[PDB]
Structures are given as structure tokens and as C-alpha cells.
Amino acid sequence: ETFRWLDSSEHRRIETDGHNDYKYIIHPKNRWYKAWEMFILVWAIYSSLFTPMEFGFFRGLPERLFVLDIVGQIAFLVDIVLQFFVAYRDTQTYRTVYKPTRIAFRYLKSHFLMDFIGCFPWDLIYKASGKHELVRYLLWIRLFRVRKVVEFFQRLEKDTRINYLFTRILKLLFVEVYCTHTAACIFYYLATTLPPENEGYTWIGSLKLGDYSYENFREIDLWKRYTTALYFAIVTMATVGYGDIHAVNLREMIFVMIYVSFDMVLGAYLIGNITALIVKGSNTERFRDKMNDLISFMNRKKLGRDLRSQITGHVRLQYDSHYTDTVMLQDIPASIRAKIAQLLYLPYIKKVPLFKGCSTEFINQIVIRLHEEYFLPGEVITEQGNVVDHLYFVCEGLLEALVTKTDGSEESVTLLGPHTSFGDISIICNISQPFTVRVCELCHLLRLDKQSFSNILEIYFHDGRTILNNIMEEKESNDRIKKLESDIVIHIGKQEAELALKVNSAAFQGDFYQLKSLIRSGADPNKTDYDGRSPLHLAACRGYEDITLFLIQEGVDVNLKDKFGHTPLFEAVKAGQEGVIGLLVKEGASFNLEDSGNFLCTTVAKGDSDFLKRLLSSGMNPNSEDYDHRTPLHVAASEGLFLMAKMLVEAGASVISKDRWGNSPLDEARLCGNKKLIKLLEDVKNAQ
């Protein structure tokens, strides 16, 4: 869809069209060609100012000024053939065309014939062809050399160093003059169009200024006639109009009626462009607008006389110096603002002594969430005895940490220069701010919030431990005030003591994404502290999964005996459950449990056919016994209990096995009737 936007994308394709072939076609940014563009601009300015002066004030040029306009035509005849070898920075397909058939074309159907007619000698042709008046009107073709001046004001309007509404004013002020030069030349020419005997019916032949009479006006010096005509044209253009010089003919009345009608529109356009420049306000009135919007809300909220002088100081600081333009920056998205922040703040954050060699992603997460702030001298930022809500890094300036003993004894603890941080020994700790950080010189602090430097400090636990090691590998803070806190927060175990607990709570709640974000960054253990549990002992069974993917990941060790003697098969089968005990047994789960016979006798005694069939179905041999070496059939034949020893004996258990009293389950079952389990034991007994 880049064919739709060829301007927003594909801006500078440079590679495959610089030196295709022909080795001659100059790119229109060459330093040897832009030294010719100014030369032809000076020649075009001269040749457009002299052309109405050649038309109006002469009838054929004299014998002097002949080599001058000969070389003036030569310096443009060079530029005529030089534009066949200049490229074609294009409009729609944004690439400089080098093809010298699209250079000969796009020029021959453009400003060539108006620029080739204007290099014929029109005052040798005039003096050769019988001195005809209408062949001297072809000098006016040479006013097409104001293209080189209007192209200069188009290469200046797209120059961002100068405001475009100021280049429009300069363009209108170059249109205002040279329309008074040309009007002066035409106003003198309309006096030369009458014969010298009718010179008393002209604007200049009938002129008398002071004691000087302008009679026989073709014999006055050229710079008196030109200054007289230009004085008329400029006091007419400015609409002063003294009337010492005025139109007398009808051909001068018509020209003045055209010329003041042009200058009225031109002066109204100049006033409009100047007003449009001024309504785009300056720095001082954009300061004073929000300053009077902030004096109110400081007069009706009744803020104190010191907080008012701090607010006015910061408003006068964001204007008049230090143009912090984040309010313009907020249109830029978060990725490009993060790239700007990694360009601007990484030279300052990487030299902070708190971050002695952390990971680059952690410093990236720091510099993503930074803010620039400026404070005047005398400000208090964090005072002693309050909670720390922001972490500050001094980019440049000079700060001062102080402390008081009893009576306001403000002694200089340290002087926080550039590449220093304060508020760092209380976000790590949970204590008050220990120092009144006061400002000495105009500073440029970088502010990080407390909650950001808890989230990115608990996520990046290796770098957090590195930060705590940077804090303790010091003089143990006796450089400041010897406020030693234990050894900070000491090594607090986030390797195994809390991270195994964190991944186990992630398995218990059933969060698969938190589980795999923890274990895919390494650190998958098989043990919890404070117990013998595992991320298989929790999730898999007791929780019974939440999330079916909790068993496939990494193949963790099954049959791990915990602190209470429970394998994860036993935890999966106690809560009953029927997916993990169907799924764990193919992974090699086992029912290892000490005194399993006594446990089976207690589950006979309570009475739970579902629990005991899940024990036997998931793998259990009911010939293991207790302290009196009694099989579960020996207790399932004690209190009657049919249908409980049936599911035992279909799972496989012999009848002939004695006890402390020397009784088998045969005659132990001979306390109840014939159907009551004695037929069952005898026909599973004599079946082999």
C-alpha cells in the first residue's frame, strides 16, 4: 500500500540511480552546481532590475554598456545549455531522474523558449532593423529571469531555519519593490512616448521642484530622472502621494489607475501576512497567557506566598529558557518515545554509580519510564522525615543533601553533582527520607516513580541483587551519615527461597502464562522451601491442574517424597481426581508410601469405596501390612464389610497370611455369615 503513500514512505531511495550511465548528469545538490546557482541568481537579479531601466530610460543602449550586456547574455547562454545536464528531482515518483531524454524533455516543453528568446541581442536587432519601436518590447521577455528569484524563495520556504510566514513577508517585500522600479521605468517611458515639442503635457516635462525646472528632460542625467520617477513610484506605493509629481496625460492617468489598484491589493496582502505572523504568538505572550491563567487559581485557592513564588518560578523557567517540549512530544507513540529516551538518557543512567554493571534490558526498562524536571536554586525536593515517592537522577546541576541534629543545624552532608542519585536508599529500604535534598544550582533531574522501581526491581531480581550489592559495597553509607540499615535488605532469597514459592503459587492459582514465563527464563526447581512440595506436588494434583498443560512441561521428577510423605500420585489420587492419575501412571508414577498397609486399613475402617478403588486402581498391592502384620482383608473381614474386600481381592491379594493372633482372613471372616465374604475367599482360594 506504499503506492498510496509515496511521500510518507520510500522518501530517499538513493542507491540504484546515482550512476546508472552517461557520467555527466549532475545531481542538483552538487557543491560546484550550487556555487553556480548563486552566480546565476545574482545575474538574474541584475538582469531583471536593468531590463526596465534599459527599456524605459533609453532608446537603444549606448556604446558603453555593450560588453556588459554581451557578457550578461553569455552568462545565461551558458545556463541554457547547462540545464540539459542537470537531474530531475521529481514530484510524484520521488527519485532524481538521470535519463537525458527526460532532461531535454520537461525543459523544452517548459522554461526554455522564454529563456532562449531572452538571450537574443535585442538592442543589436533593434539598431539593425531600422530602429523600430515594437522590437524593443521583446526586452520584456528577460523578466522571465525572476524564476531564479522565485525559485530561491521556494528553496527558502522549505528551509526550516526561517519561518515560512516570514519568507512570505520577504517575498512580498521583494514583490513590493521591483514593482516600484518597473513602475518608475514605465512611468518615465510613458513620458518619452510623446514628441519633444509636446513635452509640456507630460509628468516630468511639466515638472518644477524647488527652483529646478525639468524642461528638456531627455538631456538630464540618468540618475536624476530615475530618482525622480522612483520617488514618485515609492510615494505612490506607500499611499503618501504628495502630488508634487502627478499624472498629466491620459496614458499616465491610466497607468496610475492600474498601479494604485495593484498596490492596494499588494499592501492589503502584506498587512494580512504580517498579522498572520503576529497571531502565531511569541514566547512572552504564550508565557503570560498561562501566567494569568495560573495567577487566578492561585488567588482563589489562597496558596501561600512561598508556594506561589515556586509555581511562578517554575512557569518562568519553562518559558524564557529551557524549552521543555514534552507537551509537543506526546503525539509521538511509545516505541519512538522509548527510542528517544534510549538516545537521550542512556549516557546519563549508565554512569550512575548505583547501576554498577546491570543488564541492558534493565537499564532500558529504567530509561523508558523517566521524566525530565528542572528546579531553581533554593528548592526542597525530598525533605527529611517523609516517604519517598520518586527516585531522582541528577543529570546536570548541583544539589545538596543536609540533615539536622536538634536545632536546624543544616550541615552539608554531601553535594550531589552530575551522575548522582538520591532517594535510592529508601526505595530499596522501607524507611523515611533521611536527607533534605536542597538545590544549589539550576538542575536537570531525571525522575523515576516508586512503583516503577518496584515492578522492574522485582521482575529483574538478578539486577536487584546487583543493586543491593552496589549499595552495600560502599563505606556502608558512612560517607553520608552512617545510617546503616542491617546490611540493607540483605540477600533475601529470590533464587530459591521466594522464586520457587512464586512459581509454586503460580502453579497453585493455575496461571499457565506466569508459570511458563517463570520457568522458560530458567530456575525450575524440584523443591519448595519450608516444605517438601514441588510445582508437581501443587498444581498437578491438589489443584488438579486448572490448566491442562501443567504436566507436559519439562518432565519434572515424579515420585518425589515430600516433607509429609506424599508422592504427587498420592496427592492426585487423594483429591480423587481422574485425569492426572490417568496421565501420571504412563509417566512412571508410583505409590511409594511408608506404612501403606496401615493407611489401607484406616481407609477400610472409615469406609470409602471410591477412595480405596482409586488407591488400588492407580497401583497398590494389598498384601502390605501394619504393626500387627494384618492385611486389609483382615480388617475388611473384621466389621463385616462386604464389597470392600471384594474390590481388594479382585485387585489381587492372598487369603492365607496370618497376624499377631495367628489368624488368617478365612476364620477372621467367620464372624459373619456364609454369603458374607467367606464364599468369596474360599472360591478365590481354591481357584489355584
Add this chain to the structure above:
Amino acid sequence: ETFRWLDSSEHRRIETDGHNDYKYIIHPKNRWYKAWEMFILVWAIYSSLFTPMEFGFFRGLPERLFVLDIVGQIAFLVDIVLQFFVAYRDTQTYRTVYKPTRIAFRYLKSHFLMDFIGCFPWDLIYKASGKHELVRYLLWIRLFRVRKVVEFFQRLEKDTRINYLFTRILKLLFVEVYCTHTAACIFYYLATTLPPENEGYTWIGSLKLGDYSYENFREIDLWKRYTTALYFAIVTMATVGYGDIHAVNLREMIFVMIYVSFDMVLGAYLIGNITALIVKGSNTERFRDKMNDLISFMNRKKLGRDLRSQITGHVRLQYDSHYTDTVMLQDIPASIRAKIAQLLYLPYIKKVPLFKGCSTEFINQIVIRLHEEYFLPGEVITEQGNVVDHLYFVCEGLLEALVTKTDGSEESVTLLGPHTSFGDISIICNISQPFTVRVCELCHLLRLDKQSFSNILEIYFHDGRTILNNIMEEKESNDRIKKLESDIVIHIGKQEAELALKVNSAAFQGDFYQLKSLIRSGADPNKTDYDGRSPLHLAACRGYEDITLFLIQEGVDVNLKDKFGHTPLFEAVKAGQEGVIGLLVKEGASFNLEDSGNFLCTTVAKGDSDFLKRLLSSGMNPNSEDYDHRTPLHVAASEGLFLMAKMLVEAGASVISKDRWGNSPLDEARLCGNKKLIKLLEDVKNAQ
């Protein structure tokens, strides 16, 4: 808090302070104080225009124009004594003070002396005082009668029919002139401050225009002198300046330097205010800068040509006629916009034949959600075979319902004039749109979306049934074309049984508020559904117990048997909920099953110790026998299940109750078991 809000508040308390006492004080907005505020306005205009003409052009008035300035002074002394009997609106409050001591004061410390010493006859005590030309400078105090005109231009920006910026240029055009009348008068006066022998060194005494020499200028008539001076002052004010009349003295040079310096900033202020009038632009360029924003997005999206006319026909219906300023409506809050909608739209919706006999709160609930729309003729709105998504109410204009059957031709089945809403029978009779409703005259449709006219229809179900039974059934409601469909609108399945389903549905998961609202809007008479269930059936135990209070519910009859034979306590015993089976004994709490003995006889065979304890602890009569005259204890002894026959025999059951065989449970236990249950039922056999 409200004392800050003084003039932005209630502000209408003049009623108590109107005529306390003092019996003379005229209210400012009287009618006889508006035949004075224009009479002496056109007296103040005359006296303010004549005062520089009396000063400049005369050296004392003639014997005529004597009664004129006599009555001109006595009219202003009539005003100077009539301003003592006029109340005034206070500045900081908004109450008209009527106290005739704060009328004499606030006036005497204000413009009273400048309106009293400009009321002495300054021509009578000039000519009768040994005439000195410095008691004629006290005529200029009568230019404090321009207070009336600037008060008229202060009581004109309070009006709302004209713009406040057009009044600020009309005030400037009254300041532009009369600063040329005063300048003409005190430009002629500076010519009369020279002696008549030095009259050739003035602007008028040395003047010669045409062939008329202005010599001995004190004997020319008054209007030639005034027109000459005013012509100079007006061609100077406009900065034209012909120079036929110019300053000659030094006092006239000084006055012209003051005057053109004043008129320069006055003309710049006029140009600025006229520009500010045009920056707040007109509607014919508020349309053109909106429509060229709609030329793109109709070219960059490549729309059709009938849609590009349908779009642009609605933006010259927004602007250029029918000024719908609803974008200026949405900053008004939703309560006040609801009151606006109740004021405007309610006579339109009250006359729609859809709503004949609806409740007032229903009509108030649909007029909040309306929208105004305008359509040009020829447009279709809802075509045939399309899903309806809006409901339309016609205000004015004329629509046309059209339907096409086979050949593409349409027939005018109904002309929809005002109060002839359409789009109604495709939401109640929930089918596709059956017509192609086309605009034949510029209309004012009121749009309600389909989703709101489902929610307000289902909430107000009585008004919904009222809508779908009164809908032109007296005039065969398919009265556009035939529309052969059996039972279109007459109770197609929404009845007074479905709210019982809604109570049962909300009760099944438990809500405490939807069933409470449905029994407040309706009732709880234990209405049922197909299976004979109840809210006591579902809310208690089918869906498991949500609140304990679901079983009381202001008094519900317990033991309501459904079609299956289940009671709401049998649902408890099958479900569990020992707190619910503790609560249900408060009511009658019977367990009437016909095969209750067979149900106990099969629950001793399935095998249940907890379910049987919930059966017997709630009251079950645990010796009732099945078809074979077998008790529950009969089967519990024949199968020989210990711990279940115990639970039967402590709950009260006869142990010698025989069966169809005549076989007691005594010898049934002896044939089944050698345990023989002798400390279980033989000891309760010999208990009697």
C-alpha cells in the same frame, strides 16, 4: 461557599425591595424612563454636536439661537433633578437599591458636578461679564453629555439580537466621526485666534479653492466655513489628504500632528475590529471548509456518484438552511438535555397512534433516546428485505411507503404524513422491513434505534402488550398492502407465564434482586412452568443454595409437589445442604412420596450412608415397606450392610415386621450373618 457565587446565582430578589417605602423612586426599566432615556439621548447628541460648533465658529451666540440653548440647558437641569428619583442596579450584588440616600450618594461622588457646571448658561455669563475668551472654555464641560451615548452603546451590547463585535465597530464609527466634527471646529478656532490683519497666515484666510478666495473669512456664512473645515478634517481622517487645505501656522501644525497621530491608532483599531468580525466567519465559509474536508474521504475512499450526492445534500442541509446546531447541544448535561427532549419531542410522540394508552413514564423513557434528522426528497430510508435497526417518528414533511412484488414497479400503499411513524411493524412483528419508505417532502424524522426499543419494550411489558394489542386493529393493521401472515401481532407467545420463567431462571442461579424486582413489579403467587416447579424448588436446592433467605421469601407454602413427585425438601436431601435441611423444619416439612419405602429400599441397595442420614434425620418414617412388604431394614439385613442398618434402627423401626414370605428380619439376619446383630436389633426386640 455560595457567597463566592454572587452574580452567577439566583439573582431575582427585587420583588421584596421594590416598594418598601419612599413612594417616588422610579425603576430603571420603566416605560416613562424609556421615553426620557431617548428624548434626552437625542438632546445630548444635539448638544454634544453643537458645543464645539458653538465654541469654534462663534464668539458668543447671536440674539437668535437664544431660546434654543435656554431650553437645552433647562432640559438637562430637569434631568439633573430627575436623576435623584431613580434607583440603580448595584455592582457587586444584583439588587436594585431603592434607598433615597444611596441615590443622592453614589451620584454626588460621581458625574454630578460635571453635569451641573455644564448646565450654567456659559454664553449668558460670557457676554454679561466683560467678555473674556477663557470663560468660553467652560463650554467644553458639556462634552460630558457624551455619557448618554456611551451608555446607549453600553445598553446595546447587553442586547442579543446584534453581535457584540458589530456594536464595537459601530461605537468606533461614532468615535471616528465627531472626532472630525470637533477637529473641524477647533481647527477653525485656531484660525480665529489670530487677528484679522494677520488672517493671511491661517489655513482658511490664505485659502483659495477654484476661483473663490476665502479672504475676510469671518463674514462668510456659517455653513461654507463648516463644510470647508469638515472637508479638511474628513479628508485628513481618511488619510487621503489632498493638500488643497493644509496647516499654515504653528498652532495648526501642532494640532494636525496631534490629530493624525490620534486618527492613526483609531483607524488601526477600526481595521482590527473589522478583521476580528470576519475571523469569526460566516455560514457560507463554515460550509466550504467542511465540504472540502468531505471532498477528500470521497476521493481517497472512491465512493460512487449517488452516494456522493446523498452525502453532500446533508451538509448544505446542515449549513446554508435549517441550522441544526446539535454539536452545541451535547455540552448540556444529560438531565437538562432530557428536559429539553421532554419539552420538544413530547407533543410529537404523544400524538403517534402507536402510543394510544401507554403510560407516561414509558413515553418519557423513549423521548430521552431520540434524535432529530432531516432528509431531502427522493431518498429511501429503509428498503425492503433489509433488517431494521431504527424506528422513525415523522414530525413534518411527507414520506411514502412503497412495496415492489415482482416487476420492479412500486405502489403508493400509504403516504406517511406527520404523526405517522414507520419502522414499527418489523420489530414487534420481528421480520424484515416490508416496505421501501421513500421521502417525498423535506421531513424532520425522530430516530430511535432498535436496541433501545427492545429494552424499553421488555422492561415495560404492560406497555409492550398495550402497544401490540392497540396497533390499528380497528383498521386492519396490515393496511398498507395485504401481508398475509397468520397471527402477526396478537400475542404470538409472550404471555403472563413467561415472567414465572424469568423468576425461576433468575432464582436458579440466585440473584436477590431480579426476582425481588419481578415480584415487586408482579407478585410471588408460586407461579409455575411445564414441569410443575417453583422458585422454592430451584432457588433452594436444584441450583445449590445461594442465600439462606431464598427459602422463607416473605412466606411461601412448602411441600409443593411437582409432576415428578419431588418436594423442595426431597430436593434438599438429594442435593445435600445440611443448613437448608435444618432451616426447612421451620415450615411444615413433609416428605410425602408414594414409593418412599421403595426409595429407601433402593437407596440401601445403591449404597449411601450420608444420603440415608439426610433421609432419616429429616423425617422419612423409616419402616414403611415396598410392594413385597420389605422394610428398609429388611433389605439392609438381607444384604447385611453394617453401619446402614444401625442408622435405620436408632432412627426408629420395628424389627419384627415381616414380609410377604412371613420371614422376619430376625431370621433374615441369621441366614445372612453369623454376626446376628444381637446388640443391634435383638436387644430392641426384647425392649418391649
